[PDB]
Amino acid sequence: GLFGAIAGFIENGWQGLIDGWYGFRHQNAEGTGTAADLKSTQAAIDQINGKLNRLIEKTNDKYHQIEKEFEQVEGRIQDLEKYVEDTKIDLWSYNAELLVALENQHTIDVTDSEMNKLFERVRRQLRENAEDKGNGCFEIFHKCDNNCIESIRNGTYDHDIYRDEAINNRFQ
Amino acid sequence: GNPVICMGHHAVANGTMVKTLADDQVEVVTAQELVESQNLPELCPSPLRLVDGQTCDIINGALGSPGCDHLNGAEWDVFIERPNAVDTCYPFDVPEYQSLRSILANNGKFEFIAEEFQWNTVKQNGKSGACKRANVNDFFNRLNWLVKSDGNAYPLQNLTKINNGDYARLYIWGVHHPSTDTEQTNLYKNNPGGVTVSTKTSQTSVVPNIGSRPLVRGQSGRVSFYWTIVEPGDLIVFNTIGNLIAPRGHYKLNNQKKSTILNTAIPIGSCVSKCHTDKGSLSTTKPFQNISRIAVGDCPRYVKQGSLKLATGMRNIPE
Numbered sequence: 001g002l003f004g005a006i007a008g009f010i011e012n013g014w015q016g017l018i019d020g021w022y023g024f025r026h027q028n029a030e031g032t033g034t035a036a037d038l039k040s041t042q043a044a045i046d047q048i049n050g051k052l053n054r055l056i057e058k059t060n061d062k063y064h065q066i067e068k069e070f071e072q073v074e075g076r077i078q079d080l081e082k083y084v085e086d087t088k089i090d091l092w093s094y095n096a097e098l099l100v101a102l103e104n105q106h107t108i109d110v111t112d113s114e115m116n117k118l119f120e121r122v123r124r125q126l127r128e129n130a131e132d133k134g135n136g137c138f139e140i141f142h143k144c145d146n147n148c149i150e151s152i153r154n155g156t157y158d159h160d161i162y163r164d165e166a167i168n169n170r171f172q
Numbered sequence: 173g174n175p176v177i178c179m180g181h182h183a184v185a186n187g188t189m190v191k192t193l194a195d196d197q198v199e200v201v202t203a204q205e206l207v208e209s210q211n212l213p214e215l216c217p218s219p220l221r222l223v224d225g226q227t228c229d230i231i232n233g234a235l236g237s238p239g240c241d242h243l244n245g246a247e248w249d250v251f252i253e254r255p256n257a258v259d260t261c262y263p264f265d266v267p268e269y270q271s272l273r274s275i276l277a278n279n280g281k282f283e284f285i286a287e288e289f290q291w292n293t294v295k296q297n298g299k300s301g302a303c304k305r306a307n308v309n310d311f312f313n314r315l316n317w318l319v320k321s322d323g324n325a326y327p328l329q330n331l332t333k334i335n336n337g338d339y340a341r342l343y344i345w346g347v348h349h350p351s352t353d354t355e356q357t358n359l360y361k362n363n364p365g366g367v368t369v370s371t372k373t374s375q376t377s378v379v380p381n382i383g384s385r386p387l388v389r390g391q392s393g394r395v396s397f398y399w400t401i402v403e404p405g406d407l408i409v410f411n412t413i414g415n416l417i418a419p420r421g422h423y424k425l426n427n428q429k430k431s432t433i434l435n436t437a438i439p440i441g442s443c444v445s446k447c448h449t450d451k452g453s454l455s456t457t458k459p460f461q462n463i464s465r466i467a468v469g470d471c472p473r474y475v476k477q478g479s480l481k482l483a484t485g486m487r488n489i490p491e
């Protein structure tokens with residue numbers, strides 16, 4: 001995808017992440033954990049369900065049309081009837097082919113995008129207390145127990161609490 | 173400083189392949205098939221009104237051939253016409269066959285209004301062995317075969333019907349073609365015969381055609397059928413010196429014609445669906461279908477592809 005997160009600096013996905021599309025995996029002094037992120041997950045799902053609904057959206061409600069099957073050739077009028085239908089089918093087949101390719105391209109970029117937005121959200125929360133390891137992970141330069149980790153996940157982490165400790169650990 | 177927090181995304185063991193602009197096999201976590209490739213083995217009698225012609229195609233139904241009485245008064249969204257339909261009456265052709273068939277199917281009903289035609293001295297109700305009704309010789313019950321009087325006379329016919337109703341009328345009439353000159357005189361008398369049907373702004377004139385044709389149900393003669401539409405405020409005039417297969421009235425035409433016809437051998441069932449193909453009804457919410465270009469109702473659009481998968485999830489990168 002355009003952002004290079006999924007199948008990019010994020011090496012692979014997590015099969016263990018079963019209650020969300022995106023999430024957090026951490027390690028601290030008291031253990032490890034995986035938790036889904038609701039906002040990013042819902043953002044992706046909403047956009048994909050939006051596409052699905054616009055596809056279901058419209059109407060091909062047709063009754064009296066033209067004959068489309070013929071026993072024997074008749075000439076001029078039959079030729080035109082067959083050419084009209086063959087032309088229509090090719091144009092609609094083209095539309096279908098292009099639509100799915102465009103939508104899929106976009107869907108993949110949207111999901112790559114939402115992965116990157118989540119990473120960037122957390123990056124900004126952490127300020128100067130952490131460093132990007134390069135694989136979608138941050139090294140956090142202060143003790144961060146389960147309540148600290150949860151504060152990051154739910155967006156209430158206050159970087160100023162830990163800043164002195166973190167700066168001292170990063171440099172010097 | 174040493175704890176770590178990683179941001180990531182889900183995956184499954186095996187996803188589904190989809191196409192993009194740049195890649196024809198991309199694995200994603202979930203996908204949705206957009207092409208319906210599965211049909212019911214029956215036609216759904218609801219919510220659309222289907223009328224099964226059974227052994228009568230719609231033309232024989234209009235004409236009132238033997239075995240078509242069940243189509244009397246019928247109203248349809250879709251007339252179901254069967255491939256194994258049988259001619260059970262006098263051998264005929266319709267010069268603009270598909271146009272008459274189209275008008276009848278589109279109109280969407282068989283509502284016949286009997287009218288009486290004071291034909292002069294000519295005999296009426298001619299029958300035939302090619303058109304058996306319980307083995308008694310009979311004829312199309314919407315038509316009246318006119319033949320010469322007992323006293324060796326077929327006078328000029330000159331009859332008029334005026335339309336002061338609030339609907340357009342469909343009159344179906346015909347011209348009989350004898351096999352020989354003796355046949356012509358033995359029925360008509362006059363030779364040649366001739367029919368002229370006209371309205372205020374239109375007309376039609378037919379010269380009968382005498383000649384030996386292949387035997388069909390023991391006959392060499394033929395009938396050619398025609399029609400005339402009579403708008404409100406218009407009227408129709410029948411003129412003949414012979415060979416007229418007269419109408420017994422007219423069909424009622426709907427002002428708005430919204431119905432159609434579907435030729436298929438598929439049985440009518442008990443399911444519910446608003447989309448019918450000649451292969452059977454579709455029951456689906458998919459936007460496309462590859463089952464048949466012949467489709468009527470509220471249907472997915474017909475396409476050539478057997479499958480088109482829409483990604484409904486991110487790229488699947490397991491482990």
Ligand SMILES: CC(=O)N[C@H]1[C@H]([C@H](O)[C@H](O)CO)O[C@@](O)(C(=O)O)C[C@@H]1O
Nearest residue numbers: 298299300301302309317319350391393
């Ligand atoms: C008006 C009338 O009586 N029709 C007679 C017809 C017609 O003269 C021919 O079919 C025209 O070709 O011939 C019959 O052999 C038939 O078909 O049963 C006897 C029948 O009574």
Ligand SMILES: *[C@@H]1O[C@H](CO)[C@@H](O)[C@H](O)[C@H]1NC(C)=O
Nearest residue numbers: 329330331332333408409410
């Ligand atoms: C009969 O023909 C005459 C002239 O040929 C015409 O004036 C008259 O309207 C016709 N009658 C009917 C009932 O068609």
Ligand SMILES: *[C@@H]1O[C@H](CO)[C@@H](O)[C@H](O)[C@H]1NC(C)=O
Nearest residue numbers: 209462463464476477478479
């Ligand atoms: C429709 O597609 C299916 C595969 O999804 C295929 O098996 C079938 O033959 C196709 N029908 C056609 C091409 O009429």
